[PDB]
Symmetry: C2
Subunit: 215 residues, 2 copies
């Protein structure tokens, strides 16, 4: 017994990944997803706008049959990095015969003066040194907007064994988060250097890093 789809399709819009918007070598994209498209009225057209001016995307929509007997259609719009970072509004309008009227969704970066992250590394608590692994902490305070990218390296090589908290709204309207890298105690004790790297739009060259090793 398939869905009745009495309301017709629904549309959702998604922002680009922060790392894509912050790296010139990458191509950030805004994405418009349409769900609950019926087999009977399967055709979907997208119109894209930037600040209410129509733009073209050179990528045809991706159409996918779903388990619940519906169709899902995805339109992707590659954008200029500064269009996003300068706060322009991106709009997608969706056309479908099952719709009483075209559906519009809009998205843009959070408004307000960007504020630079202050990045700090902290070593393992003394209590932890007796275990097989220790925790290295990267504290990242005072940034805005919340869009940010955090990674860890060792010897110019990416580290994988880390977890980062969601960004948290602080009392002054800025955001903070922490990232925790788990490393073998032997690596810490022998003097390996670990680096927290951060990308955010308010940083010079959108990049900063802070290192830490046993003293």
């Amino acid at each position: 017994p398939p869905p009745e789809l009495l309301g017709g399709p629904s549309v959702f819009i998604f922002p680009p990944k922060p790392k894509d918007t912050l790296m010139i070598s990458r191509t950030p994209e805004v994405t418009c997803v349409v769900v609950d498209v019926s087999q009977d009225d399967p055709e979907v057209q997208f119109t894209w706008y930037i600040n209410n001016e129509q733009v073209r995307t050179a990528r045809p929509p991706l159409r996918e049959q779903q388990f619940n007997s519906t169709i899902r259609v995805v339109s992707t719009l590659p954008i200029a990095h500064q269009d996003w970072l300068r706060g322009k509004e991106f709009k997608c309008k969706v056309h479908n015969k099952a719709l009483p009227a075209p559906i519009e969704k809009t998205i843009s970066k959070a408004r307000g003066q960007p504020l630079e992250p202050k990045v700090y590394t902290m070593g393992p608590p003394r209590e932890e040194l007796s275990s097989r692994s220790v925790s290295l902490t990267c504290m990242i305070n005072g940034f805005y907007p919340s869009d940010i990218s955090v990674e860890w390296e060792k010897n110019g090589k990416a580290e994988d064994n880390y977890k980062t908290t969601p960004a948290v709204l602080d009392s002054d309207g800025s955001y903070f988060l922490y990232s925790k890298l788990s490393v073998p105690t032997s690596e810490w004790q022998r003097g390996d250097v670990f680096t927290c790297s951060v990308m955010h739009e308010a940083l010079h060259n959108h990049y900063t890093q802070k290192s830490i090793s046993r003293s």
Copy 2:
């Protein structure tokens, strides 16, 4: 199960960890019904614990919404141990517009509870030139994710702290960090600050860790 488009929807919410973990408080499970129509405003709730029907003394609260709908809230006070021992709480929602009653269930995450490891860390040396410094409480290795974290100075509750959501770690336990912002002058003169944690895996459901310059 027959789903009505535009009809009411139900969401169920767990008790607050601090309520569950303090014998003096009363934890409650909450059932919220939204998109209730003006034409059919009456909503009845039935509650169950492990499928045994129970009564709540709390009449449902009906509230008009800015979006022209009605929202109805039902609160079920529960025994601390019913939550902590993993019983299933079920709310069944009755409304004339619904083709069938809507049911939602909730229970504590299953698995051996694991005790949080609590650590405090002082401010980065770089902050010392500022008018305020950040004190960090790192809390690792706990399960389930239900936890309460506060800060004190001597014995009084502190202001100006924020705590991250719990994050799922690589070994399936959870961690979080809490940040307390204090005047640099207070830190420099050796004031004592305390990170306090309540979690079901702790002895007496409580532990704390202090931090000061000396």
